[PDB]
């Protein structure tokens, strides 16, 4: 899915549902980290 970039530490709301912490900003695109 087309989603915004941004520092892990900003993620946590992309990263909600997943329930996960950590992120990595890559490819125009914020990834969801443990």
Do not use: W
């Amino acid at each position: 899915i087309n989603v915004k970039c941004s520092l892990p530490q900003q993620c946590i709301k992309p990263c909600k549902d997943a329930g996960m912490r950590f992120g990595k900003c890559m490819n125009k695109k914020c990834r969801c980290y443990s």
